[PDB]
Amino acid sequence: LDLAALTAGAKYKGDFEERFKGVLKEIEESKTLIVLFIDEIHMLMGNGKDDAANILKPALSRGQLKVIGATTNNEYRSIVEKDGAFERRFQKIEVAEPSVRQTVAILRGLQPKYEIHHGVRILDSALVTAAQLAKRYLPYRRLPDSALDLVDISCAGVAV
């Protein structure tokens, strides 16, 4: 539930409350045990706020509305320092960075996607090397993204 949900699908003062207490109300009942999530995630600090409870607490309390949230480490601290009620409603989960092995496994699973994306052959050792390099030259950047970007950028390059 996002983007349009946040702003883009509306344009008047008060529309937030109307689409919020509308789509959420629809979600809250009958049509399966709906679990929602946010893609802009930190966004609850703006998409909740006055409605930090209303977004979920009474919808859960009255039935089954559940959500899967997310936040960066800094944003987590911020939502807690700002509100903290989220630590009564939600359960904090750490998400790991994969090892080079795991990264490569991911790349291998998606390797044909990448080959399809550009009509380019990709060496298995390029997934290994890209993962090794990404950690070695950009250790502070997400390994699987960096490894992939290195590949998708270079794939695009040769395609050009």
Ligand X SMILES: Nc1ncnc2c1ncn2[C@@H]1O[C@H](COP(=O)(O)OP(=O)(O)OP(=O)(O)O)[C@@H](O)[C@H]1O
User: Rule CB under 6 A: which residues touch ligand X?
Assistant: 39, 84-85, 87-88, 106, 144-145, 148
Q: Is 96 in the site for a second copy (CB under 8 A)?
A: no
Q: Is 21 in the site for a second copy (CB under 8 A)?
A: yes
Structure tokens at 139: 């250790």
Shortest reach from residue 85's CB to ligand X, in Å:
6
DSSP label at residue 67: E
Cα→Cα distances 43→2, 7, 59, 72, 93, Å: 9, 11, 19, 11, 18
Rounded to 5 degrees, what are φ and ψ at 56? Answer: -155, -55
Shortest reach from residue 6's CB to a second copy, in Å:
5
Q: Are 33 and 68 in contact (CB under 8 A)?
A: no
Q: Is 108 in the site for a second copy (CB under 8 A)?
A: no
Single-letter amino acid, residue 103:
T
Of 64, 70, 98, 117, the residue at the interface with a second copy (CB under 8 A) is 117
Q: Are 37 and 69 in contact (CB under 8 A)?
A: yes
Report the Cα 90 to chain-centroid distance in Å. Answer: 16
Single-letter amino acid, residue 51:
D
Q: How many residues bind a second copy (CB under 8 A)?
A: 61
Stretch in the footprint of a second copy (CB under 8 A) among 26-34, 76-84, 101-109, 122-130 = 76-84
Residue ranges binding a second copy (CB under 8 A): 2-4, 6-18, 20-21, 24, 39-40, 42-43, 46-53, 55-56, 59, 72, 75, 82-85, 87-88, 113-114, 117-119, 137, 139-141, 145, 148-149, 152-153, 155-157, 159-160
